[PDB]
Design a protein around this ligand. Structure first.
Ligand SMILES: C[C@H]1O[C@@H](n2cnc3c(N)ncnc32)[C@H](O)[C@@H]1O
Ligand code: MET
Ligand code: SF4
Length: 367
């Protein structure tokens, strides 16, 4: 097909358990000495055996991150514009069958929240909507982007997947970043997590980052939703997808997120448990695989864990977040999921200073 779905097809018969069974401690030590890592060297760093070398991995991953990013940490925050959605994502608080107050911000409410967020010093903003081309079509997001570009120098979207021409229209309006999570790369698990709605189309969402990069998107952020499937395999396909995009679009800045499932309206329990050490090994392994790729850490993680991971390869953190439409002015507003780190921008910035890190607000200052 000429997309990343061809790579997924080539790994449909890959025996991950047989590969891990062949991994030894000498394989891990060799890879820690290498300059460049193949996709399977990355898979070897995700292995149970590699847990014996997490200290050595963190030592090297910290050095690689300082080399390409300096002692900086880019800050951003999400802005939910609307929560209308036709999809039935079992893990999400905005799924169609959930009962909540559906709301879409007027243009004046968007500008007011933009002023509230800009008053904290943030220059990077990420906007989100549900999948509802009737209540939040591309034209609506285009009008919001035009207001937001008065306050923020970098606007990223995390919305429903678009055609290449739709992305090109939003890039022309001032969008410079794309965040889209494949959620789960296993097609069988994906079908169970998405029983109804256009999001059930596995290929259309898998190929969204490419259509965006072809339209000229500057940066793309991807990731599997940790908790939905075998985490090592999902982490591997996130790195493989990141590597595929970076080799295909050498001028695009490719980043990943390792978001873990959180409590949410609906109450769906995650299929597998992902521990804090799993999350650390994932981040460390990916930093060694792609040393120049950004690694975003959201407020799904608690403050103490995010403070530990400042020195572990994370390059972008959210602060002062809110997952509800208008929840910054309404404490009873229902969010997409429950956040963990409730710290403001200022509290996160003051913590970073205390660790010897420079909080930055524009992405070109990370060096
Ligand atoms: C905006 C992103 O938030 C993630 N997301 C959706 N539902 C949840 C949840 N219950 N917990 C944590 N993250 C979630 C999805 O991966 C979605 O893409
Ligand atoms: C608000 S969830 C993220 C945006 C969109 N609904 C998606 O799942 O891709
Ligand atoms: S994850 Fe996105 S598409 Fe799925 S129910 Fe939530 S808002 Fe809708």
């Amino acid at each position: 097909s000429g997309t990343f779905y061809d790579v997924i097809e080539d790994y449909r018969h890959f025996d991950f358990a047989a590969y891990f069974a062949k991994v030894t401690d000498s394989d891990v030590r060799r890879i820690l000495r290498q300059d460049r890592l193949s996709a399977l060297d990355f898979l070897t760093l995700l292995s149970p055996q590699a847990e014996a070398y997490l200290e050595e991995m963190a030592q090297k991953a910290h050095r690689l991150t300082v080399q390409h990013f300096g002692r900086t940490m880019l800050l951003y925050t999400p802005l939910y514009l609307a929560n209308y959605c036709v999809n039935q994502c079992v893990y999400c608080g905005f799924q169609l069958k959930n009962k909540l107050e559906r709301k879409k911000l007027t243009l004046a409410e968007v500008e007011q929240e933009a002023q509230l967020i800009a008053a904290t010093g943030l220059k990077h903003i990420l906007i989100l909507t549900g999948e509802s081309r009737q209540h939040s079509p591309v034209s609506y997001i285009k009008d919001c982007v035009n207001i937001l570009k008065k306050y923020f120098s970098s606007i990223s979207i995390e919305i429903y997947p678009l055609t290449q021409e739709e992305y090109a229209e939003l890039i022309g309006a001032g969008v410079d970043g794309l965040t889209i999570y494949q959620e789960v790369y296993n097609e069988e698990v994906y079908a169970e997590m998405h029983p109804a709605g256009p999001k059930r189309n596995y290929r259309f969402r898998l190929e969204a980052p490419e259509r965006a990069c072809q339209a000229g998107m500057r940066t793309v952020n991807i990731g599997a939703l940790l908790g939905l499937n075998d985490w090592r395999q999902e982490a591997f396909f996130t790195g493989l997808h990141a590597d595929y995009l970076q080799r295909r679009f050498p001028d695009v800045e490719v980043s990943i997120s390792p978001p873990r499932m959180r409590p949410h309206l609906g109450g769906f329990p995650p299929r597998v448990v992902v521990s804090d050490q799993n999350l650390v090994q994932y981040v460390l392994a990916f930093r060694l695989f792609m040393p120049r790729s950004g690694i975003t850490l959201s407020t799904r993680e608690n403050g103490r864990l995010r403070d530990a991971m400042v020195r572990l390869g994370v390059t972008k953190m959210s602060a002062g977040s809110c997952t509800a439409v208008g929840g910054r002015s309404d404490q009873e507003a229902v969010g997409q999921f429950q956040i963990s780190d409730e710290r403001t921008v200022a509290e996160v910035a003051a913590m970073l200073y205390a660790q010897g890190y420079q909080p930055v607000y524009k992405d070109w200052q990370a060096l």
